[PDB]
Amino acid sequence: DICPASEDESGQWKNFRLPDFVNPVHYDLHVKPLLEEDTYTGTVSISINLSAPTRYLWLHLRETRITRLPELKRPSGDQVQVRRCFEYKKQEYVVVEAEEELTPSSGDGLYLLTMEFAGWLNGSLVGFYRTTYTENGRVKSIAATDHEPTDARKSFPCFDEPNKKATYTISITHPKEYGALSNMPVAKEESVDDKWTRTTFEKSVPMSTYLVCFAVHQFDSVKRISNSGKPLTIYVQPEQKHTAEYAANITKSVFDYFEEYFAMNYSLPKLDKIAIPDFGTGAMENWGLITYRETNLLYDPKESASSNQQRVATVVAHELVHQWFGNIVTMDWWEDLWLNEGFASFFEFLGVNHAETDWQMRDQMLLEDVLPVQEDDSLMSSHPIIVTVTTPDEITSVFDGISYSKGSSILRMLEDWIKPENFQKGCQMYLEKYQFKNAKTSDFWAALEEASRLPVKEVMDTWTRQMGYPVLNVNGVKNITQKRFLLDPRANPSQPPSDLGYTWNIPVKWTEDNITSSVLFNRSEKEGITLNSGNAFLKINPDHIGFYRVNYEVATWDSIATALSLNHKTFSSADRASLIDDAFALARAQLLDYKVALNLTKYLKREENFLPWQRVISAVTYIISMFEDDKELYPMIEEYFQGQVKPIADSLGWNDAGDHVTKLLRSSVLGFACKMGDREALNNASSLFEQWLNGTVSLPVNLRLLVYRYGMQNSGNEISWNYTLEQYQKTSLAQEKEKLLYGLASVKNVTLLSRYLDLLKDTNLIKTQDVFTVIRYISYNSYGKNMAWNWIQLNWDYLVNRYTLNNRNLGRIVTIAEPFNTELQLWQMESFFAKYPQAGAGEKPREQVLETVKNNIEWLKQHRNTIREWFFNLL
């Protein structure tokens, strides 16, 4: 109405990217929520550095409307006259046109642009929004913001690109029963009415829009003080106050550890953490005001699992890394998003390893990032680490395994190759140089090149400007060659076109009889290299430290299987996991006969370590799911793997005894025993479940999930389902809530799963943040694999309307179709995609799941007989 939409394309605002010549310096931002009305108003004054004659000024805005014709100031101070404003929908712009046009800001003076705006707090988890919780039976409110990547523009009009850094002074007018938080400490509070308070916060350092955050709350708090003397506090519902203790501990330990490690002071005078009762992501690193989903922040040692403990520790550590990597130094464009997320995914492990000594975190990187992303990045529908993004939907899509896990993995390779000492020193220098400014990937290589004089740019570029990774082919124990590793043998290894032609500079490390050597394998050595002691065995890629697979000669592989049978401790736990992971991926890729791979599992009755078991379980999970409906193969695979875990499952027993890693092992090992149909493990789950239903017994924390799942699956009925649903509502602990939702997803009853699906539309029962989690859980159920898939189809229009096509979790939901393995199922997927071809942030996930389902079909055709023979002959 006031800035009507116009389809006028003839101007620079048709460009997706903001212009070079318009630049903000300072934001004067005021918001006033009407909490009970689910509305807000605000004005913003922006100081602008103009560089080129322009008759239009434009910036980002979505959903929120401008309410008053905006007003512009010359650097002298005069009022610039305004002819019109109009919204440009296609690129999310509000555009203002001067009668005239004016000239650059030449001195220290700047233009001032001021605009009034009104928006909504309801129906969304992005921008500025309100949600509720219950305290002592009263419904309470809390409002907060969430912006990354392109939602700042929903909160208030701004120059919403990460490189358009400016300084912030924020003020909020709110009811006095509430406190107000932002990025910075509170400067001054003044009474507006006898009812309203205006809270003003002190000036910010230059920062990106996506990091700007404020909240209105009635939360209690748990406090700690850094070595720097700065208050670190976690805000938390009074009811849940006890569950903030652990996160408080970890924040102190990791904050103190990082400041020392990066040799840089934290830029702000305080740091706050707070979990919003309904929160769309896991956590967000807003400078000084880090927001969380409760499952990632709130932990009860009496109720939560070690899995939960580690998740809390890791996400806090992750979010703290961003205070240096991401906040102080930010990427110039989202194409370089890995400079934020990859670095956070790397240092999170260093952080938690300091805080928790016997968690073997450095090894756990293999389980969390390296090996899983090696699956992802073996598909044709992967993408290079540096990713071309041209729409908001494309931007939000690349918050994925490549940015995080491959990013983490190639940094891990880099540190080892370049040595930790020099890696550290290089990071510091990068951090010194670009502080409060923006960097490109090139800027980071050059930084480390100063620390090593090694050819970092030349080597790392190959891991960074093309998708995929290599397999190393072993010829004659000692000669290696490189070839791109793709899961689909039929795929064209040269597509999509890459300047580097899918050859890499691979820093290669190996172990000759306990002694370790190093070589860089040049791209230009087209016919491979030879590794420099009259040897009979060569352990290549120790601890799977490089981002590649090693394919030994078959005879070698055969001797490894024998060596594992004789004395498995010959190899380190990581090395075992790695060899196993490679073998099975190689087999999957038709690069290694499956008999060779399966031979490596024969030793397992004596396997006792976490890492190998995790990668074995991952590999078997895939094979077993491909044979679910095969009445012939399944029992035989079940029977075998049941026999292989049985000793360790029995040995560890159904009880929380031992150190961290041991307790995690028991969880996954007992779970696998249950999965494989071990009658005695299932009976343990059923017995405990039956006891839990008596309403007193508090289950051992690391067994709960297994007990809810297998307990419900084996003896669940309407009575226990209803009970479990009540218990889910009643517990305050989000970590317990989540386990209970998985439990409810486990019942073997179509009617009850149908009720559960219907609950997804009920926001009094399932929170908006949790809908996709629940859908995914149901999809794992033997009945619900198809129910969830059908439901998202029938309710696609409803989901799009509720979440929008820009929602990451909605785009990814199609991956529930991953276990599909027939031409029928593939046709269903394709028909549904063709009916709803606007995929938004789901465009890549659709590509990926189709490639996966196609590979499954092929895989069955190629391998069913081979895998049959191995099992038939054995059993």
């Binding site: 990547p149 896991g282 956590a283 690193e285 990632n296 992750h318 997320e341 990451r808």
Partner: peptide
Amino acid sequence: XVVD
């Protein structure tokens, strides 16, 4: 961003 953790994506959860």
